[PDB]
A paper describes a structure:
The small molecule 2-l-phosphoserine was selected from the Fragments of Life library (Emerald BioStructures) based on its structural similarity to 3-d-phosphoglycerate. Both 2-phosphoserine and 3-­phosphoglycerate share a secondary carboxylate group and a phosphate linkage. The key differences between the two small molecules are that they have inverted chirality at the C2 atom and serine has an amino group in place of a hydroxyl. PGAM tolerates binding of this nonsubstrate molecule, probably owing to the nearly unchanged relative positions of the phosphate and carboxylate moieties, which are highly coordinated by the active-site residues Thr21, Gly22, Tyr90, Lys98, Arg114 and Arg115. The replacement of the secondary hydroxyl by a secondary amine is expected to make 2-­phosphoserine unreactive with PGAM and the fragment is expected to be an inhibitor. Also of note in the 2-phosphoserine structure is the unusual structure of the phosphorylated histidine residue His9. The bond angles between the phosphate O atoms, the central P atom and His9 N∊2 are close to 90° and the P—N∊2 distance is long for a nitrogen–phosphorus bond at ∼2 Å. Unlike the β-phosphoglucomutase structure, where there is an ∼2 Å distance between the P atom and both the enzyme nucleophile and the substrate leaving group, there is a very long (>3.8 Å) distance between the P atom and the nearest atom of the 2-phosphoserine. The inclusion of two metabolite-like fragment structures in the ensemble (2-phosphoserine and malonate) provides starting points for elucidating ligand-binding flexibility and potential for small-molecule inhibitor design.
Author numbering: 1 to 229
Write the structure that this text describes.
Amino acid sequence: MYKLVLIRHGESTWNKENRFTGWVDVDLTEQGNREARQAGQLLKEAGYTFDIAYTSVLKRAIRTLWHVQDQMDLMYVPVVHSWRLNERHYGALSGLNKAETAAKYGDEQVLVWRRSYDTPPPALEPGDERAPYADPRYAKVPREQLPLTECLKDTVARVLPLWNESIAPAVKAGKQVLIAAHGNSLRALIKYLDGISDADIVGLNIPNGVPLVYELDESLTPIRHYYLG
Ligand SMILES: O=[P-]([O-])[O-]
């Protein structure tokens, strides 16, 4: 039997401002820093340790990981930063206030853009300042693999290779793994782990900064899961 711990980044500036974020590299609020430290303290007091961690290339998740590491006295473990764990790409919605958007386009249209498993937000133009092509984070990524928008389906497809190629072999090698990531990239990973239907995944929400523990059997199939706290 194995344990895997997942954690969503603490409150970001745009979470506070109610803006769609996606791949925009915004940072934690004071609250979010607090949440991350509390999560690290909660794992420390429960006796968890880790041998490796996975995160995105986005600072809100990385700083969350840093606070956890600092509270646990785990500043030295290897960390794999992967674009594959980035938040779902919000396209031309990135940066817009969610309430303003719903007023302009309607509540239903926004709920389709936010939670339709299969229908993506309107795309960035390839010339937009928000596009990923000139960002050093993505300099070794095939141009054709870089998104201009994503639905959860695309996010699931992007997350899986990192699971199959790196995280699952670590878990099988006996490494105690922590994944510090994002609301929709953790929804996507959960969807895969728990074998959740396209319909059923629509109502799953992940709070900021709360450890989510998975117990996994010999074939890495979930036995049970629970939040700590
Ligand atoms: O707001 P977040 O889950 O990237």
